[PDB]
Amino acid sequence: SGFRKMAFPSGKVEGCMVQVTCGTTTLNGLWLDDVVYCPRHVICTSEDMLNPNYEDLLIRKSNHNFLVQAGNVQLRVIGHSMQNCVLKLKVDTANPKTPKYKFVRIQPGQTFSVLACYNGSPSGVYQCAMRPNFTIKGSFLNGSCGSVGFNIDYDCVSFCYMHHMELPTGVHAGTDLEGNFYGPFVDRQTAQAAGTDTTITVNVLAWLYAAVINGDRWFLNRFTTTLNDFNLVAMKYNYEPLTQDHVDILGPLSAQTGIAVLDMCASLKELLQNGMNGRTILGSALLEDEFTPFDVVRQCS
Amino acid sequence: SGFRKMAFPSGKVEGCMVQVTCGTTTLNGLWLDDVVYCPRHVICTSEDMLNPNYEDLLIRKSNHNFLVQAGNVQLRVIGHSMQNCVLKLKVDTANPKTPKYKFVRIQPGQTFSVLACYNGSPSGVYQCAMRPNFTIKGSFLNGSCGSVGFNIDYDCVSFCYMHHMELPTGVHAGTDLEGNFYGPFVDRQTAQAAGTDTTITVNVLAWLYAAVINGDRWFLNRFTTTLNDFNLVAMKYNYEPLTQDHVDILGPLSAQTGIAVLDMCASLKELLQNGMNGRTILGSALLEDEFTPFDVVRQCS
Numbered sequence: 314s315g316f317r318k319m320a321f322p323s324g325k326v327e328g329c330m331v332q333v334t335c336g337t338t339t340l341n342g343l344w345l346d347d348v349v350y351c352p353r354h355v356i357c358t359s360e361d362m363l364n365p366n367y368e369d370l371l372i373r374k375s376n377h378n379f380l381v382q383a384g385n386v387q388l389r390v391i392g393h394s395m396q397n398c399v400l401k402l403k404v405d406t407a408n409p410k411t412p413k414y415k416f417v418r419i420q421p422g423q424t425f426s427v428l429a430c431y432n433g434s435p436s437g438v439y440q441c442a443m444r445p446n447f448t449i450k451g452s453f454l455n456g457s458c459g460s461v462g463f464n465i466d467y468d469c470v471s472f473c474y475m476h477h478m479e480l481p482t483g484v485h486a487g488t489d490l491e492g493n494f495y496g497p498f499v500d501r502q503t504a505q506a507a508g509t510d511t512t513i514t515v516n517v518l519a520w521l522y523a524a525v526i527n528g529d530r531w532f533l534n535r536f537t538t539t540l541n542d543f544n545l546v547a548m549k550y551n552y553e554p555l556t557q558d559h560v561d562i563l564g565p566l567s568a569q570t571g572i573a574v575l576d577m578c579a580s581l582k583e584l585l586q587n588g589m590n591g592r593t594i595l596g597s598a599l600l601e602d603e604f605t606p607f608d609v610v611r612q613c614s
Numbered sequence: 615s616g617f618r619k620m621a622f623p624s625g626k627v628e629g630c631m632v633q634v635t636c637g638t639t640t641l642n643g644l645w646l647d648d649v650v651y652c653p654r655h656v657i658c659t660s661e662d663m664l665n666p667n668y669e670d671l672l673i674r675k676s677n678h679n680f681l682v683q684a685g686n687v688q689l690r691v692i693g694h695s696m697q698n699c700v701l702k703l704k705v706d707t708a709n710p711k712t713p714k715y716k717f718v719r720i721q722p723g724q725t726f727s728v729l730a731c732y733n734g735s736p737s738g739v740y741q742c743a744m745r746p747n748f749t750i751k752g753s754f755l756n757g758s759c760g761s762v763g764f765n766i767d768y769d770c771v772s773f774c775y776m777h778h779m780e781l782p783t784g785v786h787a788g789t790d791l792e793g794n795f796y797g798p799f800v801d802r803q804t805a806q807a808a809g810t811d812t813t814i815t816v817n818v819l820a821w822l823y824a825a826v827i828n829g830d831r832w833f834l835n836r837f838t839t840t841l842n843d844f845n846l847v848a849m850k851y852n853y854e855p856l857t858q859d860h861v862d863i864l865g866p867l868s869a870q871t872g873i874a875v876l877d878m879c880a881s882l883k884e885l886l887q888n889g890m891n892g893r894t895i896l897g898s899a900l901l902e903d904e905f906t907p908f909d910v911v912r913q914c915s
């Protein structure tokens with residue numbers, strides 16, 4: 314029993330982390346087979362990064378401008394190319410620790426583990442959700458760019474995020490592994506900011522199910538609501554609307570607890586209106602929305 | 615910027631996890647060089663575990679009673695022995711992935727990472743603190759025994775916890791790697807329960823410093839208190855007394871923020887008396903006490 318914020322074991326991704334240095338900039342790369350993936354802004358100069366023309370910057374580079382270090386041994390770059398906002402460096406050595414992997418572009422509301430790295434060396438692991446505004450609330454210092462987010466599915470590593478920058482509110486923005494930014498962000502130092510966020514409703518409900526599985530019951534009631542009347546409450550409190558799709562995703566949790574989704578919605582509606590009144594749920598005094606239904610099932614087997 | 619619950623990268627410990635099966639029981643072992651460490655209650659039978667005599671149970675075993683699986687390959691046991699509440703199984707193969715390691719017995723208030731495992735296979739990683747009542751608030755299902763907790767210090771793995779059992783309140787109890795239980799607990803299925811807990815004061819203050827470093831300032835004030843008057847407030851709200859030792863440990867955080875420890879104590883005193891009033895600190899609506907000063911420095915560099 315017990316419910317914790319849980320990340321995937323990170324060993325498979327640790328074996329892929331390298332250091333990439335271009336000029337005066339140093340950050341992290343992902344070394345899979347004979348290619349290293351990293352953010353393209355590594356080729357930027359401190360002056361020409363208010364509005365860089367990356368095609369020009371890259372044409373002016375040669376393979377010997379990129380230094381790749383896997384642990385101690387230097388990796389020789391034999392080719393370079395750019396795909397969207399990620400740079401790809403061909404190296405003459407395939408990574409012997411390359412796991413089975415996939416590149417996946419995730420939907421807002423989904424979670425993943427982040428392996429924060431500095432200078433090619435893993436520093437820590439934590440769990441994150443793609444917020445509806447396509448930022449993540451991460452923990453990233455300078456030098457952390459190129460750290461990756463991932464999920465694991467029976468030793469297949471699904472990479473879904475590479476870190477690029479921090480926004481003015483302290484949240485973070487990045488790309489999928491094919492270099493497409495999540496959200497409307499671009500890789501120039503400009504005035505872009507996070508838009509207004511919303512709470513991930515299907516995740517709060519999943520976490521309420523985790524609470525029930527673990528003995529937290531004070532918030533339950535006999536009431537039940539409809540989908541329509543619930544979604545009116547959600548709008549008022551800045552919650553994402555609840556779709557039938559989400560109701561079905563919450564199916565297994567509903568069966569294990571015997572509490573129907575729309576029964577749990579009536580509990581959530583009451584918590585939104587009255588607050589918690591000095592009580593806690595799974596150790597928290599606010600409603601938690603960074604656990605997906607999958608995360609709850611995986612930990613509450 | 616940003617502050618997250620962060621575990622150590624777990625790859626070095628993943629390479630040490632094995633499955634140990636004795637009779638009908640299966641749990642996890644730690645494979646370091648040519649020895650496997652696991653809880654001794656693996657040799658217990660469902661009947662004789664209300665009050666087992668482990669010396670007798672072990673004398674009645676032979677090496678062929680223990681099955682050790684590292685991934686797919688079976689490991690042959692060539693010797694067995696017992697040290698306190700841990701069983702030690704000599705195997706004929708040294709673990710080629712043995713990291714640099716130490717066994718450490720930690721003090722209440724200290725944190726570590728847990729690699730939860732089932733059937734020798736890592737499942738997830740999370741952060742935990744040794745509570746003052748020598749339990750941990752973990753996430754553990756059946757089959758998780760033998761999962762280990764650890765800290766890392768420049769590729770030296772310090773193992774400090776091995777998991778043995780769950781208590782009636784859903785919290786967890788275990789040993790150091792030499793098989794001495796934390797707290798007064800014993801490895802028989804009896805009526806032992808967690809004693810009353812207290813809040814880890816030096817950790818709350820460290821987390822308030824993390825808040826300041828990350829821009830959360832609404833709780834600061836111009837007041838300052840003495841150690842004596844603060845400790846009177848701590849007692850009233852079930853907080854551990856604050857020692858001069860702790861004040862000195864909080865030194866670096868005090869300097870980086872410019873806020874003296876006893877200045878931050880006057881903020882904490884006011885939060886204890888008035889609550890948060892609908893405000894949050896680093897995303898939480900209650901005071902967090904499972905970050906040590908070291909954890910804050912490591913993440914707020």
Ligand SMILES: *[C@H](O)[C@H](C[C@@H]1C=CNC1=O)NC(=O)[C@H](CC1CCCCC1)NC(=O)OCc1cccc(Cl)c1
Pocket residue numbers: 340354357362453454455456457458459477478479480485499500501502615
């Ligand atoms: C890369 O390592 C670094 C990670 C940032 C630095 C602190 N937290 C992070 O997430 N990324 C940057 O410094 C980017 C580089 C820009 C280059 C040109 C294209 C757009 C990205 N800049 C950035 O994050 O600026 C905002 C910021 C906020 C706080 C502190 C710093 Cl150093 C920068």
Ligand SMILES: *[C@H](O)[C@H](C[C@@H]1C=CNC1=O)NC(=O)[C@H](CC1CCCCC1)NC(=O)OCc1cccc(Cl)c1
Pocket residue numbers: 314641655658663754755756757758759760778779780781786800801802803
């Ligand atoms: C070992 O894998 C298992 C881990 C427990 C099971 C659920 N959470 C955990 O942490 N440990 C046990 O089942 C122990 C075994 C006892 C054997 C004899 C000596 C003392 C330990 N028992 C135990 O935890 O009992 C309490 C309990 C509470 C909830 C659910 C279960 Cl299955 C057991």
Ligand SMILES: [Mg+2]
Pocket residue numbers: 533534535536537575576577578579580
């Ligand atoms: Mg209800």
Ligand SMILES: [Mg+2]
Pocket residue numbers: 834835836837838876877878879880881
């Ligand atoms: Mg003050």
